[PDB]
Amino acid sequence: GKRVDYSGRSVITVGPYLRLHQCGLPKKMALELFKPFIYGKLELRGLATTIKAAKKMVEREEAVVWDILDEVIREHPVLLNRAPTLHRLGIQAFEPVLIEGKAIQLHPLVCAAYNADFDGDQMAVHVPLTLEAQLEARALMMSTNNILSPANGEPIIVPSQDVVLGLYYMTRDCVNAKGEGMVLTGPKEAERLYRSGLASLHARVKVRITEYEKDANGELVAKTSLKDTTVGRAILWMIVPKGLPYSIVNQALGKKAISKMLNTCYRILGLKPTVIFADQIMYTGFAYAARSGASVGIDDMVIPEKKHEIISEAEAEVAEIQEQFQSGLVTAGERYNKVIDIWAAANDRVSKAMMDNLQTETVINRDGQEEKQVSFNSIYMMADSGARGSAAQIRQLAGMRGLMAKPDGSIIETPITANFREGLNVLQYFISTHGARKGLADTALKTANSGYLTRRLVDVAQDLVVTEDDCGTHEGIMMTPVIEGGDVKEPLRDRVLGRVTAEDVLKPGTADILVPRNTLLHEQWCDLLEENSVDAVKVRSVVSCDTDFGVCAHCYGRDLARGHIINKGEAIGVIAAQSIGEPGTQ
Amino acid sequence: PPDLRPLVPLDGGRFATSDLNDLYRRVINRNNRLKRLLDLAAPDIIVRN
Amino acid sequence: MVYSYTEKKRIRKDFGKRPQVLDVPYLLSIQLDSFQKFIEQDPEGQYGLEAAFRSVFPIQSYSGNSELQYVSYRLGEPVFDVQECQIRGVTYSAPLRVKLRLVIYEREAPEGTVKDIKEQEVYMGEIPLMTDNGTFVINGTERVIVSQLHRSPGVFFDSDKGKTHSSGKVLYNARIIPYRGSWLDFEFDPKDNLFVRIDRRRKLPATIILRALNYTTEQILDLFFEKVIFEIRDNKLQMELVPERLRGETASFDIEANGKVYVEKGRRITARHIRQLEKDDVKLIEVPVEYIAGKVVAKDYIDESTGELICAANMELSLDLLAKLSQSGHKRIETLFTNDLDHGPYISETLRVDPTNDRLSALVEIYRMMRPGEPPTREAAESLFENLFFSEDRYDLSAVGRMKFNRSLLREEIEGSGILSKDDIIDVMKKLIDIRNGKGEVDDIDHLGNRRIRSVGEMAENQFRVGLVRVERAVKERLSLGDLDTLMPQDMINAKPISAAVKEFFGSSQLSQFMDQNNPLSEITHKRRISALGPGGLTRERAGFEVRDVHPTHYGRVCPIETPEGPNIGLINSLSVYAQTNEYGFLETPYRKVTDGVVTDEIHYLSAIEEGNYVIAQANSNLDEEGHFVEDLVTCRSKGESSLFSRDQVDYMDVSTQQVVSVGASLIPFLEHDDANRALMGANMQRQAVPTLRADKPLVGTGMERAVAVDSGVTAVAKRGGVVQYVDASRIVIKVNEDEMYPGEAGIDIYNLTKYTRSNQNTCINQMPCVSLGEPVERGDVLADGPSTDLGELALGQNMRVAFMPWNGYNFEDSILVSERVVQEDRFTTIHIQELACVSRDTKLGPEEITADIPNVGEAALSKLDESGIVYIGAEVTGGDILVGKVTPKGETQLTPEEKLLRAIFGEKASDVKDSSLRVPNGVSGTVIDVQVFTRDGVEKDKRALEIEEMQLKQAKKDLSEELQILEAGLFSRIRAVLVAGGVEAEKLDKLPRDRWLELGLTDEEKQNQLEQLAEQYDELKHEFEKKLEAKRRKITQGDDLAPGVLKIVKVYLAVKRRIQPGDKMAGRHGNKGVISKINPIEDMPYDENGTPVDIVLNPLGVPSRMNIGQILETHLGMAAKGIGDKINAMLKQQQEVAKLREFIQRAYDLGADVRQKVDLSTFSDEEVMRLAENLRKGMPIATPVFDGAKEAEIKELLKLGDLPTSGQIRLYDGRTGEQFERPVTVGYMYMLKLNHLVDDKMHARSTGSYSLVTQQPLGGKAQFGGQRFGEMEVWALEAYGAAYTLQEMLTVKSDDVNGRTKMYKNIVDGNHQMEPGMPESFNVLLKEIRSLGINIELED
DNA sequence: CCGGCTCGTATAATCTTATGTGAGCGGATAAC
DNA sequence: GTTATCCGCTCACAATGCCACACGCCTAACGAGCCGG
Ligand SMILES: [Mg+2]
């Protein structure tokens, strides 16, 4: 670890107007970094002769220098870094956009990959300065080239909490609103109805949609129909590209739904529509999250009406078990077990009652009498969309909270009968402090142990590089989908997606070559292997690869974080050690 | 090479010493004292010590 | 009811329902009581310096009959008072005087009378005193000693099960921890042999340390075991029996008596058969002979006829020895009673393990354990074993050690010696054997009956005793050859090691920390701090996990929620609110004595051990007005476990609902609606809130900020009650009421408020007056608002209008948007104060000058300087300009032995000049507010230093003239009033000066003559004021001493003003951080239907994830407070009548359930009401106690009193589109802080800077103009891509290749992007220090 | 009139809340 | 007996990264210096 010239440090800040391949750079710090490029551009254009004239001109900060600096920036990328680097997405390269400020702006979709807060997290800046370094930082490391993760083939550009709330609030329905049941021409007329205030954002309506489907072999097929949908869904359809079918935006669109929206858009179309589609999603998600106005208030946490008598019946039952212990019929251990069972049952009943009271209380007039629907409550939209929180956190807010366990390892008799909307008294808060400090100490030591194990694994696997193409053997392993005895945990599709077959696995129709012996199990081919219900597939591993001083290519299969088979040189031992050692904190 | 264990320039008076320089000074003092004791036909107990 | 004269300025509306009975004590009591206990004239010498002088002295030579004894001690007056000591640089010391009496005897008579006694006041050392705020002053700065939490002196019986031998068998070690001395441990091996060790050496059998105190083996077996008596009947002998010994056994034979068969063979002995023997009362039964086949004879037996040793003590018996004792007639035979369950033969096995046999051999064996190779000699081993335990010099338990050691053995008295005894060690062995048997249990460590706190005075006297021991060794070595009758006891007491030890501990220990002066909260929570690190305790990487969790006896003694997080959690605990240090050093906490039915008000204090016997009610238990538990079963607790008890069963009740927490988290309103993690983060982030330009009270605060802001030191409090007589911006002069004047010449009071000066975190400590002229104040009331205070209320940040809504993504995870109205009202602007010094140094080649003559610089940079070489007071300078012009001589090669004579006198001491002027660092700016000049005694002062002299001299004249003018007027009134007697003429009086009134002739009464004598007494008082002025000017005029080498010092302060900008960190009191993302204009804000914009947009998504739900209740209550404020403002702008205003304030102050204030405005007499309205018109301040909060419905009714909506949600419009935000949003007033993680302390950059010396790498840090550490994991990351050339630049061109990097720099400036690889210089460094070992290492080819 | 004092400076000394490994070596331990 | 193993004791070696900040880094006695008594 050598310290490095042309570097810098700041605190960061969001800036949601950026594109994906650029970042906000402070003006003064960018004049400070690129001083020799500035000196060269000044002595080229005749505006100075010596180096000292250029030093005086750039210490006066004259108005020619900013135009010169903008000529210096234009196509010259910059590396950014966050300090506890775990996995290889820790440092990435962007282009700069100049900012009159003192902080670094940073595109919000990337912020999950850095695992960055905005709680005061600091970042650092390095400069590629030669020609090959600029060209590597543009090709191998620009942030439009890192969508899928190297640990598993999943997009790392999932839209986060606020965009989730915006898109979930746009694409819903309610059974009586302005302009319900009218008819429309395009999606743009639905937009023009939303702006004028004539029709509301979610009122059901038949529209006309043209959609393109590329089942024709390399071209697009138009198809025009009338579909029963929503004004918000017709507005969101205007940023979907040509490829996808309309049933991707007809549902309620929580978090996993838009994640697989991005994933199917990556599968069918390519790279550039995936990047530009993530940008349009981020922009319109923030826009309609602004126009929502989704607040939170103390009257958005509905207490159940039946909490009181459930606690009263639980107290009657524990008094009865206490009397059965007092007469001497039941021993102390079974008394303990009966009490913990009945408080578990009472907690589950209270949680069921509060969730049933929140999710569907909203009754609205039909233009007939009354109906039922999913609610428009605040925290229920914050949980049901999967933006922040689970059933557990929203359970502790209004229903009673769990059973706190003492640090000895036992679990206490009397559970915390209160929620957070009501007040906790002295003893119960003093009990909750145990779990607080226990979790904090566990995090404090877990960090260091994960760091040391990652250090040792990347020491082991460092000298190993994919070095030749085809070792050409006929060994390997046999994969079957794992089954404990409960449910099948991992199917055969997920494990043996993208690994090169060892032997020709025959069809269940015997003596029929279902797969050639030396091909790559890509996705369509994996489905056509799945259809005949194959239980065991033999496949080439790395542990039986033949190549001296390295690993052959077909013995490793396709690469993660990109699409095709792996190129000769990818230092797979280091990315493997990082992929094991990265989630060790969790 | 003595640039690779440099003598710390303080402000006012004396220079602050490193650790290697103190260890080499101790070794050289001990070596000179033993060489002089070999030069003067010392008794065996003292040269052993 | 009746309120103070500042308490009537505003009233905080107090919710909370419980009647309190005990107010908050003085929050800094522990520091002041400790250091007051340290230095005090103490009879009986149990503690303080007197104990340290009684422990060592008298000191005497090696029977040379020269001896030094001790008379008394005295502390000299401080030569320097506090503020100028903080300016100049020294400690706030105090000198010490010791009256020593050197005696020498007359020879051939040791009890003979001494012939020479010599008494002196020897000077030794300097002991630092304590400021009135509990702090110390060390090197110009102000430092605090943190209290320590360590293990108790005494004894412990730990188990430590598990990991030994992997068999599951537990162990039982017993440790004795002395207060000053050496350890003592007892252990078990899995062979059940009982071992001893001392000071963690190697193991020994405990039999030898039991023998070494003059014990025979039969005495050992008599003490540690009982007896069974066999009597030899001549055939098939008998056995005595108490039948309870047979319990839990298997009968080896047919147990029977009087023909009645009790137990058959093979049957285990039942308690039924035991009761049969109880009824039958059997004393003897008749065993078979072989039953003694395996037992052990207790004591030794010889042949009474021949002297043959038949069997010794602790011998395993056989039938041959039984036959021989029957032949010798030894019928009465003792036998060790053994068992596997109750009385285990544990000692006898160990006594058969050990090799060592008797007393002198035992002393030899211990003496060989302690030091190997030394000659085993009788007297040396005897002296070693005496000095380990049985002497005062090197084994001292305290009183606390004797306390715990008599308590943990069920003794009776609690006063014993500071040494051990025979009974102590054998009782430790007996108790350890009993614990191994099964009765009794272990003592867990985390329980606070075993962990004491050390305050400052005890650590101070320990270090002082260490220094006294070193000086004692030196003076004993000197006085051992004491043979001179001219020796006086200054010749022998070297005052260097005592001062070295005292200044070592107070200056740079591990427990002498800086005090964080950026809140009054930060100071008062840093002094109240209980630490577990340092000497005597553990370290932060060897503490495990059990000492960090919450033991269930932290209740009311240690705050559960205030702690640092990160590396050291649970070691730096903060002290509770009502906690008191015990008489011995444990932590006692208050409780209320309860009789049979009546909860009384007689408060008691309880230790950590006494609490686990009684029954204690929880605080919020509803009561009567007479005092009765109104329910029947009450939530209470007995021993670590809360439960539900009866009504005529409780004994003690809590004092208040505050006592669980500390002062750092009793200031969070609605704390009881928060997850404990976020309460921890809020309680950590309050004490980093930087102070603001204009301070501002909080609307929603707990009822605690008045005691915090007063009981700290940042505000000034009137000591005596009176009338305000003079108020300037600088000082306040108070006339004292005549009831509070002690009758000899009391007069007035003067408070000199501290102006803009430096704090330790470079923030601006300030004081301002808050009383008007001619206004009454009362004793114990505030006068000067310090930093972040407001009318005697702690007030850290400011409170603002906040809307919870997502606004265009500018608040994505935790970011905060701020409108420009917060900037234009400059209400987070912060003053900072930097300090820069410059010294003139006595180098070679000539000295250095402070002159204004600098070559190679322009005239314009010399303009801000005066002719003396120093910038003026108040010249607004920026980064780069010259503060102080200093020049250095530069020869370089002159070498003439005559030219240097003329250059040192005639040649100005200046031949060729190198510029070494103190310049402003880069970036920083500001306004020079203060310059200090310090000149060595001997150099003549420069004229600017003389200007400072004259200014300070006029300052010294002014105040003394003020006191003379105010003092002489009483005797002026007296000469006039006695001149009334006899005859006075007032028209003739006032035409001529006052001495002429004094010399106005009148017939001599006795009263006028005594008052004339008092007139010359004020004349000599005037002479005394003259000598006061002379005493001031001899201090000011005289030059300074300095460090060896320095001529003069110039100190320059600067002050700079920091506005707010995107990047700073603001955060509420509930743990909700944020970086200011954008800074919007006013018209892009969400405005409500009335038109007023909203200052700050938060993000709602942060509320359901982390359960900090109390902030929304704070938001609603704050909107209710400002809602009352707007109606009060509307009633004052219309200037309505005070009766209606009185009525509205009264109706706003009743409002709710059974609150305990009950104010009534029928005593405020139509002027306090208007002043109270002028204070309340910006909002009505509201109190909320922590665990006695305001319910939801009362917030609803207070929102109903104003015209606000009940739901707390208002329709909000849009700044950009002018449309409506559809659902209603939440607006309110939240109180926010500004933390000192400012962006202009972090944004740091580098293109090409400096380099280090050893390896040619760039330096690190911001100040040294460094580059970032592109560390190891980032290299793994670049290897993980296909990046190859970029790794080569980050490894070689950017650093450690010298020719490579200069070639690269020239190549960039030329406009060609190539590179030159080279080879790093640090690798050649690695080669040159591997070759420094015996390792050849080269490079092939 | 040399060092008594006073200084320049070169250089020696009586803990005590940790865990988990591996790895080796000395003392007991069970056979022809 | 004597030989090939088994077991308990003692001891070296590891424990994330980065940042700021701040204050610390000898002297009683052996070879010289000044000049007083
Ligand atoms: Mg963060």
Ligand SMILES: [Zn+2]
């Ligand atoms: Zn292979």
